[PDB]
């Protein structure tokens, strides 16, 4: 897929810091309402990430549920050239409740 | 037809062998008695059981009945 580097970037800082992404299955949608780029870009950009074992993908009721692997946090640790302060938000150890 | 079933026929004749002195020939009195004697899940079965018990009671006074 041909994604501009800048638009692919916004796709990467949404799949990090809130390391889960939800995308409705419509390829011609102008705006996925949470990543200011084409909706098709979001699907195909994360299809590569799940293709390279960085996100699990689940599909239910014409909707994509993307979740970031622990191995994928390390990939964005280096490729994004970001500080080594990790834990996007769903990994911040907010701890459950009993 | 109005053929009573086995769940009402056998359950009614157990009452007579167990509570004959308290029973009577009146359906209305019998209907109230069986609500405190048996645990019936539905109101319709309660009247059905008492209505056949009354028939058996009405038949016992004319002679001996089979199964009681």
């Amino acid at each position: 897929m041909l994604i501009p580097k800048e638009d692919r970037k916004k796709i990467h800082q949404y799949l990090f810091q809130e390391g889960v992404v939800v995308a409705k299955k419509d390829f011609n949608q102008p705006k996925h309402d949470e990543i200011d780029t084409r909706n098709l870009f979001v699907i195909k950009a994360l299809q590569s990430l799940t293709s390279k074992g960085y996100v699990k993908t689940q599909f239910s009721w014409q909707y994509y549920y993307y979740t970031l692997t622990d191995e994928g946090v390390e990939f964005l640790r280096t490729e994004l050239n970001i500080p080594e302060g990790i834990l996007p938000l769903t990994r911040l150890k907010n701890a459950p409740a009993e | 037809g109005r053929v009573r079933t086995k769940t009402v026929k056998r359950a009614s004749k157990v009452l007579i062998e167990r509570f004959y002195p308290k029973l009577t020939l009146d359906f209305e009195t019998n209907k109230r008695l069986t609500s405190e004697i048996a645990v019936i899940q539905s109101k319709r079965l309660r009247n059905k059981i008492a209505g056949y018990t009354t028939h058996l009671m009405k038949r016992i006074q004319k002679g001996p009945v089979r199964g009681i």
């Binding site: 889960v20 689940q58 990994r91 | 048996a38 899940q41 079965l45």
Partner: protein
């Protein structure tokens, strides 16, 4: 926005139906039984019942935290407006959903059907079920497909009580040669029911004879 009463109660049901299937697909490996949506002021409490509440609440509750985020981003909910709790099912043997998912994880491991089928027959009865019947249909090495029923104990079939004391779960099992369909019908004991009727409609319980006392002619006991 402004939604009619007819269209609002349906939306809550449709939301439940879509949310329930989402857990079945995602938490299939953890014996997902069901979900309860407890609406409350300033919060949307969601109670999920699974055999294993460690797979959902694993590695400092990372998965459940990363799983509630997938629902805020799909239903446009406020991040504080929803709270998810994972609760263990008390009687795992009485849940046909847990028993059907457990059977699939065994059938997919190559275990023989007879050993797998009898593993849920005895597990259901051990938990105290009144009856259980398991049907497995599909193809196994043979080109022709077949179905086998494994009953046990007492089972009711017709009328309303089947909607009250019986829960059912069907799942499709993905095999290398096709699809295996399993049906797990479990009838719970009506005496333990805590919300509906506590007995079958035709169960008549006659009390015992309180008679056989001795009557004395005619005294008066004063107080």
């Amino acid at each position: 926005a402004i939604l009619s009463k007819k269209k609002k109660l349906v939306a809550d049901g449709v939301f439940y139906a879509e949310l329930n299937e989402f857990f079945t697909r995602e938490l299939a490996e953890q014996g997902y039984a069901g979900v309860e949506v407890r609406k409350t002021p300033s919060k949307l409490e969601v109670i999920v019942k699974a055999s294993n509440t460690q797979g959902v609440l694993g590695e400092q509750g990372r998965r459940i935290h990363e799983l509630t985020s997938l629902i805020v981003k799909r239903f446009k909910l406020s991040p504080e407006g929803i709270a998810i709790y994972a609760e263990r099912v008390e009687e795992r043997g009485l849940s046909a959903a847990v028993q059907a998912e457990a059977l699939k994880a065994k059938l997919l491991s190559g275990l023989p059907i007879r050993r797998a089928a009898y593993g849920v027959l005895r597990f259901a009865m051990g938990a105290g079920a009144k009856g259980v019947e398991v049907v497995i249909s599909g193809k196994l090495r043979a080109a022709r497909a077949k179905s086998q029923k494994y009953a046990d104990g007492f089972m009711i079939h017709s009328g309303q009580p089947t909607r009250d004391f019986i829960d059912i779960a069907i799942r499709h099992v993905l095999m290398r040669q096709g699809v295996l369909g399993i049906k797990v019908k479990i009838m719970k004991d009506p005496a333990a029911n805590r919300f509906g009727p506590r007995a079958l409609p035709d169960a008549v319980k006659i009390a015992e004879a309180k008679d056989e006392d001795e009557v004395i002619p005619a005294p008066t006991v004063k107080s």
